[PDB]
Amino acid sequence: YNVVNDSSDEVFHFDMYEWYIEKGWTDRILSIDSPHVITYLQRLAETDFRHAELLCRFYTTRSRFFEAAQVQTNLAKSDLNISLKDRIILLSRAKGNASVNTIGISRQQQQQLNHEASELLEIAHIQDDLLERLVADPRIPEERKAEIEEFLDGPIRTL
Amino acid sequence: MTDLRKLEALQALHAELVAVRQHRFEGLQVLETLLEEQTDAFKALIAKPARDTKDREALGKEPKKLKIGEEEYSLNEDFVNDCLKLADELDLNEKESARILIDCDAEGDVETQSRPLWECGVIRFHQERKYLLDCMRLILEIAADEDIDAGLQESFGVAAEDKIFGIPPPWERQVKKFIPRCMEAMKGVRSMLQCMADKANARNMLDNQETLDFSRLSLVEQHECLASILHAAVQRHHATIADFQDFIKILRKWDKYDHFLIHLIPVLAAYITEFGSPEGMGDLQQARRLNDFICSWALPVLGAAVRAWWIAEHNGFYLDDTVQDLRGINLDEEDEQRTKQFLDALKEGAFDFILSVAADCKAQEWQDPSQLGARQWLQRKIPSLPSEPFPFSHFLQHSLMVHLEGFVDATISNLPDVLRKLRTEEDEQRQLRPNHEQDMDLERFLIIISYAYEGRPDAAMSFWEDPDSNLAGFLQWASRRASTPLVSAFCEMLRCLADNEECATAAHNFLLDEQSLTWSQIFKELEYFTTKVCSEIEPESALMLECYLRLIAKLATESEIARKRLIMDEDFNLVDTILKLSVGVIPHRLRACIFYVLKALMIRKTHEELDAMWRWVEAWMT
Amino acid sequence: KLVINKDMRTDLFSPPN
What we know:
The structure is cut from a larger assembly and holds chains A, B and C.
Chain A (H helix, E strand, L loop, with lengths): L1 H4 L4 H14 L2 H4 L6 H9 L4 H13 L3 H13 L6 H15 L8 H30 L5 H11 L7
Chain B lengths: L5 H16 L6 H10 L1 H5 L9 H9 L3 E4 L2 E4 L2 H14 L3 H14 L2 H4 L3 H27 L6 H14 L14 H27 L4 H26 L6 H12 L6 H17 L8 H11 L5 H15 L17 H17 L1 H12 L33 H20 L1 H17 L8 H12 L4 H4 L1 H4 L4 H8 L6 H13 L4 H11 L7 H16 L4 H20 L2 H6 L7 H9 L5 H14 L5 H15 L1
Antiparallel strand pairs in B: 1-2
Chain C lengths: L17
PDB class: transport protein
Keywords: nuclear pore complex, nucleocytoplasmic transport, alpha-helical solenoid, nuclear pore, transport protein
Entry title: Composite structure of the human nuclear pore complex (NPC) symmetric core generated with a 12A cryo-ET map of the purified HeLa cell NPC
């Protein structure tokens, strides 16, 4: 592992960040002082959920809660393939992270994000309560249930 | 700014807490916004990720581009060398260590301090723990402030339960408790400080001397903050017997006397108060086991003091037989056992250690020359501090004085017969062998009482409000016929119990007749010594004269009735006696005390007093 | 923003196509 960390090959270190993510070694990746890994995540954060989650962990441990709430909220409003329940977790985290002070950011900007995440989380829970009840309902034909699961187990719908 | 880093976030947060503490609520809305952004910080007090090999080998393999979170940075042969150096000195992860160094380049503090880049990382790392821990003390301190709005006082209270102690609020709700994390947290500070001296001494045996001194100061401050946080948490009845046993074992395994022991003293005091005294876990059965458990020690004075405090605090149960159950238990045997244990603790030097700690706590760089040699004529056998620059705080001193006054009240209201028998034993010992110096237990105890009651008139008034209480009873009983040391200790106590004018007037009215000490005997002894010197003198007589002069000066500076009476009293004529004593062959201390007494008497005077003073001066100088 | 429109929906109790 010395030979690994003693390298200056950049495509290599990118390939190793991806490999650590694959194997699940949050142990060793979260323990890198470097910003090089943060910058690498900032480009692909809004591309994949698993990468965004890593980026948000780096922000939170650095008391940058508002920036994580921003990543999580945009990810919940996006058209990436994300389940409704995963979008409930993202909003719930963003709601908490925007409710606490982050230095350098105005109280107004925090509250406006904590409010957008609170409303979207309220709608998401309604949608989850619906989807669950509809799937379990004995009086609903199977043919329709599959159709319900397609349109409700994804991005959050209007009221 | 708005996008502040970890360091700037804690530094700004600290300023806000001081505002609310200094009666400035202009940042209420801004304060709550910071606690939410640093929620993950308050959860873990102090935790450094272990040095991993994955980052060590990867950092040096491709030291070209670094990715931390969302931003990206470029590593060069110069910066990469600082990461490995910082990680080795502090044993910190390469990723976390790099982030610290990156914060310095952005803020650009290398020019503000003109130091190597790798050294700044050590300071920046210590600053985080300082504010991260120091800010917690302000939260609990403000949550207990009674001079603020009740609503705001409760906001910081519930917040600390969840942010610091990790306890959710009442309106909601695998995890580890706070104490076990705090104990392990303080442990890391000790191991880190120990390894620091070993490595530092090796290379020393440079431009980093001041940095090492600042790091040691930050470490001791963080340890004091952790101790205060632990004390506050224990004050909320959030402990158990396992933590108490662990703390007792850690104390038994104590090696050297230093500031850490003085910081932990109040922790054990609060532990005994919550468990030993009937003001907490009032399980009488549980207290019996702890008594035998407390009653191996690498320092006997510590065990003696602990046993004395435990006995003093636990003797409050056996006062009456109506508030608790005391059936099928003998009293005389337990009383004799506690008495012999307290006597053994005294012989081992419990009060001596307490007095040495109290003295070392208020060690001041400069002292007023009007009180030189006061309370410094005993036989101190306890080793002193190494004199390193580790100044104490104010809240710690306040808590120490409060605990000492509480212990004094308990010992006075629970063990009067013990003090009586000790005084009689000392008297008979001094009588059967005057050539030898008996023990100074009572004098040391009175000096500790004086140190406890200093600059606190709210507590000193208790000795004058109720003249029929136990406090006034002991005050009047300690004024009977005794030796020079006891009289000097009582005079010093009276002098220190005159922080204001009301207490000074009360002491004046209580000293004069309305047997206990009276001004008549004082002036008689003064005239006797004057005639003896003018027709040798022993140290005890000089000490008594100096104590009398200091007491008179204090009463004249604090009280007005005494200043107006003694100045023109025909039966005393203190001025003539002090002048006849000063014109004699005596050391300079007595002359200085007489001059200070004259100054105090002449602090507020009129034309007639000025004329009389000038007449006396001319008559005695011509 | 809510807008009720009972007019044209999709029969929740009939399959598609």
